[PDB]
Amino acid sequence: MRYGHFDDAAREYVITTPHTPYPWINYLGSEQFFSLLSHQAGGYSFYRDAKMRRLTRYRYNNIPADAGGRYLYVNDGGDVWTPSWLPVKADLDHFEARHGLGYSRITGERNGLKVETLFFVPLGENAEVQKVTVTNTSDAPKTATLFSFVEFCLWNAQDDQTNYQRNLSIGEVEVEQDGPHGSAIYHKTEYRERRDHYAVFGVNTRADGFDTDRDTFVGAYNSLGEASVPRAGKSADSVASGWYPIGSHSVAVTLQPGESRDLVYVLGYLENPDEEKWADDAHQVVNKAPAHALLGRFATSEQVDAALEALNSYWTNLLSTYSVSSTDEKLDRMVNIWNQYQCMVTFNMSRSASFFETGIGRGMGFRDSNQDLLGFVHLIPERARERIIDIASTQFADGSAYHQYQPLTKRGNNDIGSGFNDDPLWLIAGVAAYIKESGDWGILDEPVPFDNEPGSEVPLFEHLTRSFQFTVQNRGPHGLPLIGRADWNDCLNLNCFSTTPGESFQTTENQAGGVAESVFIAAQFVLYGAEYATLAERRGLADVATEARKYVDEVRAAVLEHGWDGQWFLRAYDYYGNPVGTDAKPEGKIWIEPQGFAVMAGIGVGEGPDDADAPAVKALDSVNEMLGTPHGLVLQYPAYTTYQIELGEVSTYPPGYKENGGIFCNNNPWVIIAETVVGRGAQAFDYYKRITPAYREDISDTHKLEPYVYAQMIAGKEAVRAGEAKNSWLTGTAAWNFVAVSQYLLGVRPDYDGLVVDPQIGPDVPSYTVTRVARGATYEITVTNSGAPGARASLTVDGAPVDGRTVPYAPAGSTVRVEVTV
Amino acid sequence: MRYGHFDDAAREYVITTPHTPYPWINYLGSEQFFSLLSHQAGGYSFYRDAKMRRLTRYRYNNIPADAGGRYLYVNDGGDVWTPSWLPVKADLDHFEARHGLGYSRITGERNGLKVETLFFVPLGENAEVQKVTVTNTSDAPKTATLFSFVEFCLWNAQDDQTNYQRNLSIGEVEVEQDGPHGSAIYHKTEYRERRDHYAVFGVNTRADGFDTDRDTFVGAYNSLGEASVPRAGKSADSVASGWYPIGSHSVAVTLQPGESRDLVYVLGYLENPDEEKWADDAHQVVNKAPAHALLGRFATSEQVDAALEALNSYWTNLLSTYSVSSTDEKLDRMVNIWNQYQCMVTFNMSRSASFFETGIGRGMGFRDSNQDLLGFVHLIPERARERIIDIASTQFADGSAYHQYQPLTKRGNNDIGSGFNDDPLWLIAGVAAYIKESGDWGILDEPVPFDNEPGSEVPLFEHLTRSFQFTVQNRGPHGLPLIGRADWNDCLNLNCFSTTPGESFQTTENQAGGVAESVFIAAQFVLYGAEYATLAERRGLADVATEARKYVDEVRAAVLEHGWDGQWFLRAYDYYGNPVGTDAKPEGKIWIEPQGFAVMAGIGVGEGPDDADAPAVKALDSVNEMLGTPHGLVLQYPAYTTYQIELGEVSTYPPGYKENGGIFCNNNPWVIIAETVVGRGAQAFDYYKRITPAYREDISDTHKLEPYVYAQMIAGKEAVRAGEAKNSWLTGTAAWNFVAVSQYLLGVRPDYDGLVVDPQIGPDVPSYTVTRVARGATYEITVTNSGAPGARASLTVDGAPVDGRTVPYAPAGSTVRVEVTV
Numbered sequence A, B: 001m002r003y004g005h006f007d008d009a010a011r012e013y014v015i016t017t018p019h020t021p022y023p024w025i026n027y028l029g030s031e032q033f034f035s036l037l038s039h040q041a042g043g044y045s046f047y048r049d050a051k052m053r054r055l056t057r058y059r060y061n062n063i064p065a066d067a068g069g070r071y072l073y074v075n076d077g078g079d080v081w082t083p084s085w086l087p088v089k090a091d092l093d094h095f096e097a098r099h100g101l102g103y104s105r106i107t108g109e110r111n112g113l114k115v116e117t118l119f120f121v122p123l124g125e126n127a128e129v130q131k132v133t134v135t136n137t138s139d140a141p142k143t144a145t146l147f148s149f150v151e152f153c154l155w156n157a158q159d160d161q162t163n164y165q166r167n168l169s170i171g172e173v174e175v176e177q178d179g180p181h182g183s184a185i186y187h188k189t190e191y192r193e194r195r196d197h198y199a200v201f202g203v204n205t206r207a208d209g210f211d212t213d214r215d216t217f218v219g220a221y222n223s224l225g226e227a228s229v230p231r232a233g234k235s236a237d238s239v240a241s242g243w244y245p246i247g248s249h250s251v252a253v254t255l256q257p258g259e260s261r262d263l264v265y266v267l268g269y270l271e272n273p274d275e276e277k278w279a280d281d282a283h284q285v286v287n288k289a290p291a292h293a294l295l296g297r298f299a300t301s302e303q304v305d306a307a308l309e310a311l312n313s314y315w316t317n318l319l320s321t322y323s324v325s326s327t328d329e330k331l332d333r334m335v336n337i338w339n340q341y342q343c344m345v346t347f348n349m350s351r352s353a354s355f356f357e358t359g360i361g362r363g364m365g366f367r368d369s370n371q372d373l374l375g376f377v378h379l380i381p382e383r384a385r386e387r388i389i390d391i392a393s394t395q396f397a398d399g400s401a402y403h404q405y406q407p408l409t410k411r412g413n414n415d416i417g418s419g420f421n422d423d424p425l426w427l428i429a430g431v432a433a434y435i436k437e438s439g440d441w442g443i444l445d446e447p448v449p450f451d452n453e454p455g456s457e458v459p460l461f462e463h464l465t466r467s468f469q470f471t472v473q474n475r476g477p478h479g480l481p482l483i484g485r486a487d488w489n490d491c492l493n494l495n496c497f498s499t500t501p502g503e504s505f506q507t508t509e510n511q512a513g514g515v516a517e518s519v520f521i522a523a524q525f526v527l528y529g530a531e532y533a534t535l536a537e538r539r540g541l542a543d544v545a546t547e548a549r550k551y552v553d554e555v556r557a558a559v560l561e562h563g564w565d566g567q568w569f570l571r572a573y574d575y576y577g578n579p580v581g582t583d584a585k586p587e588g589k590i591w592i593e594p595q596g597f598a599v600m601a602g603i604g605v606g607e608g609p610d611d612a613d614a615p616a617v618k619a620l621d622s623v624n625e626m627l628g629t630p631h632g633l634v635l636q637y638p639a640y641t642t643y644q645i646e647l648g649e650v651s652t653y654p655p656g657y658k659e660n661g662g663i664f665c666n667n668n669p670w671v672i673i674a675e676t677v678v679g680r681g682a683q684a685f686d687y688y689k690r691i692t693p694a695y696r697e698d699i700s701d702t703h704k705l706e707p708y709v710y711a712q713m714i715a716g717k718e719a720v721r722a723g724e725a726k727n728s729w730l731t732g733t734a735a736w737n738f739v740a741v742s743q744y745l746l747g748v749r750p751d752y753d754g755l756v757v758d759p760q761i762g763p764d765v766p767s768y769t770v771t772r773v774a775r776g777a778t779y780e781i782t783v784t785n786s787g788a789p790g791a792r793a794s795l796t797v798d799g800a801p802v803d804g805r806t807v808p809y810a811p812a813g814s815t816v817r818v819e820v821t822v
């Protein structure tokens, strides 16, 4: 069951009905200004930070969903409709929405008028541009009046939604019907006071009329679908004082049969220097210079099209670093287009703002942004470098870190908790990924403060030492890392014991003492502490590196001695020292995270995939049997059916959802990668297909959410809603799947001194070529793959056999031809 | 222009159209369970705390406003309509809503079916009951199906609105079609975990069908006005699993010509002891015992009626303490009914939850709850006593206090700022009003902790000494109290200097040092420091009292010497010692707060109203001339037209709104009482009329909000919206106008040892009788009033002339007849 299709040549998803199972969105912008845009034009835009500089208003949990966005009401002879279908819901003769890379087009046609709108954020601009084309598709002349509409937000979205007792009296606007390229409205709430910024909403023509007051435009007792002004056929020229500012312009157009007209609208974010905020000595009238310039840069359709083409070229350039040509078109569209596009979006948004995350409490996550770096470092290495510096600046001197930072200020906060003991090790992961990718060893010398404190700077390498030493100096009675508030699983809260309702487990005070340990952080420390040992040796720190290898070896042996349940890895020891994730308990017998992570770290790996005695194989077979479903692998089994006070948030979810028996997709690639490590390519690829957008498109009515991006959670087998996704777009699933498919399944993966070429994908992809740009040289990697279990590659390079699977990096400008036989 | 009228005999405001300027609400409940109910059935319900235990969901800033509430969709022959008008907006043949004391009735009739709903919260119950009467007003038999609807909230209203990434997976219900009294739906989100509470929505009949999933009942792409289930005419029997739980039952009705049927619906809040939460050993099925009991208590019309009658008797008893019979029916309905009812609501709700206050950030305000006591102590003194202990327990040992407390827990928080230096003295005000009303001197001996700390208890009197000593030990260089974060005016933030956008002025950190002083707090200290001295005297503390009256004299002298601008009182000195509220400045020349409060404290009062040399008279004349408008007295003049960094939030409002040139009604009664003190009753009464609901009903189209309650803010003369109110219901204006009218205009006011009878109302009310129950005796107070300027009363009591205007309190059971000549 499908509601659209991929168009690979156009790099677009084509939605051919308004009647999708859920609003399906795109993100516009890749730099500092972003828009959430549904296939019904719903959503909102913000500059840098969705909580603090939100330009336009959007209602989550509206009835119906997604009533509110950038609308264009058409009044043709008294009949009013919107080409986005919502909010008016007039019958359309034709409707299509295409979501592309950084832009979308939505086109609706009714009664001989076709209205197509291109929405995008241009490169280098803090603005959302709309190019609207109206065409008379009838055989007689048409006259229609077009009313644009956007509802402003009062910048601080939390305040906007809660503090009406103040903010119903502060809404301010200016209206400029006769500006230099057409008509503009200025939304300038609090520019009177501390804000140096305002929004503009303008059109490239002298508008017939305007509206800036929502209640006037919409009318008492009316929804957006029933707005009075478009039904009247003329603007009310309303000038807001408080209440709800909007931007709306009316333009009447007359079109002969076949004739079209373009109109260009811009929503822009402008700043002025404090000294130049005002046009007038009395400080009453905003300085419009930068808004006039912006509108000048988008006064013509030619300017729009040039900017859209520059954006297309930017995307071609980004996607030129890693591409695959295989016999599986679903695989190829994920690797070449969709998974990389999503990794840009997660890089920019972290978990902050989607149609599920509300752009309020969540900023840039310390763990989240590190995981997203793993799937982003090849796309724009300079920006990954900057992100590493920003994240490491929010770390404390003892190696612990703020769990997230505020995007606008880059300062850490505790708003979604403190003391997540996996956080410090993710910094080592992010840096190791970045150095392997770029060979930029010099980043280890970058001075980086602790908690943004001027003069506290130490080299970024020393931050990694603090991370490493934090785990070393925080192990429990089994030699396993103490878990703290939680590890990667935010709902495994072993120090909590909360009996007070409604207090967030994420922020609630934890109990000192106890002996609670995490098998997940143990594996994480084996995996990434090995990379820290390597960086130390490369830095000429021989003794630090020897010591680091020793501690890694200790923790590794502890996993096998104290972290093994018999047929799978234990999950943890709780506050009392009792095992969690043991077959000795009735529920939560096996938990997926240490199964994938321990095996990625090589723990329990035997002689080959057919070595039934190896703990890794036993562990992965137990995952397959106990956690496997057609939709992916669930987090634990059985799910908990009553509240387990000593485990925290996890048992508070009904079984089959989120952390209690949901398919929590971020941890599935760990098992995929683990499967590649033991030599079971076919099984690893199977798990990849079960959760991957292009493979799940044919069950779009089950998945419900966007068929072109990963989501955080698919309901698991214990849910009545099994198969149904929540929380699309913003998830570490995107980066980790890209890691899994690009580096482990397809097998092309940067190491410090050469490119590892190690396919392990099984027999469903028997022939493919990867084109990989790495360290300035292009590698054409032609793979002939039997897919036989445990079979690993041999290579020839430029006509000559090479030993093993690592190709030493060639000099920049080379074309290196690698022939791979598996 | 009116949209309804007062019905005095019924104690109701009758709304005769759905098409009001704004939603007009009532509050149901007076104990621990409260509903906000508009004349369109919109709003929500909560137990004790609107942030933490909110039963049902309501959207502020919805389009249209107030789409959402307790709906009953009637399907007659395929035609669907709701008697509340919204959300369907079908043409009704008749519509009326009556808001009463603790109940409302909303009736709509269409095509031969009349549907009346009585909504109320019964005494002693944590539930909202609706008795629905449907009548066939046609001459032929009718059939219809009625579908009830309410949307649940996930208890924590903040989480409900912002934390979808967790909470879309936690919604849980149970469905009981065949229970003891009829059908019931249980909303039990998080009862699996830490909540010992669930909600029930039931009806006293076996429903034909039900729905618990919003998306199924409403249908995809639909608003509530388009709900699919009522249109199809059959329930979908949906059982929610996450997403959006609701309660809906369908009931088929059949009616002969002229026949009616009653249906009783109950939304209830139930708790179980932890040990009895579950019906089953597996802990999956909630114990329904308390809900079954509740539903049996409201299984019949007879039970509903008995309970509504008990509620009516309760209100007649509450209102028997103070009433007036005069020549002015507008004055009488305010004093007798509406102002007292509003005082009950502000006592219960503080500033927490209205159609403007969102029931999230604001709990029970320390200042607000003390001002509310002034207008509530005569209603239920035992409940006032307890509130005093509650508030005083959140005070710190140094006499400063948390600015508010969380209603559920009674623990103070800083969520809306700290260090408001008027707060400590408001506690003296509250206790003095309480003791004058009740003669309960023993409250001063009650053990009360500081910040709820076990073992920190000291007598309540000692808390007052901490408050009094706080001001004494925190005066600035002119002998005036240091202002701290702000005084009563929350936007006068002299220690702020914020240049950072979107950091609340209320909570942002303040700068140490400086010399910022408040003339407001100086006047509050002179007024209430005198009360504290009298309490110390009655306790035999002659040293303490003598020293107290000394400091009162020093501050009074400081006001005259350093707080006087020439024709009015100064407002403040800023951080650098520069005067605020001086004719020397271009804007904010005169501010109303010290003019009212200084003169209330007797500061600057001369020989009589025509003593034109007296500072009090010059100050009051300046108020009249510079701040007077037809709608009330604005806060200051001119309003500030640019941001003044040294003054904090105040100049961030556009001129004419809130604290920047708005009519901030709470401060108007201070000027009214001031004018009574100086002997100008005619002017005091004029100001009272200008802001008083019964008098502004005839301009309902200008005031906009409820015509039967005070609001916090009416737009001032500098606003394009001059005359239009915001923030109705929840305001200190209610208590302080009750004080003004009952105690100063009408002149009947308790003092420690007798009842003062001192009318000062001017010639427009030439005779009236007050009936006042005080200390167990009833005083029948018959006034003949010339209104002569400055003329004050002489009294005869029970046939004998008495000296002065204070009647010593008579023994309990007495009827004391007081004859008053003015």
Ligand SMILES: OC[C@H]1O[C@@H](O)[C@H](O)[C@@H](O)[C@@H]1O
Binding pocket: A165, A166, B416, B490, B491, B506, B649, B658, B659
């Ligand atoms: O914190 C509540 C305070 O908020 C300020 O923004 C408003 O101007 C005040 O009227 C209000 O009392």
Ligand SMILES: OC[C@H]1O[C@@H](O)[C@H](O)[C@@H](O)[C@@H]1O
Binding pocket: A416, A490, A491, A506, A649, A658, A659, B165, B166
């Ligand atoms: O604070 C963010 C966290 O909130 C928890 O309630 C959820 O279960 C987690 O998946 C999410 O990461």
Ligand SMILES: [K+]
Binding pocket: A488, A489, A490
């Ligand atoms: K997590």
Ligand SMILES: [K+]
Binding pocket: B488, B489, B490
């Ligand atoms: K205030």
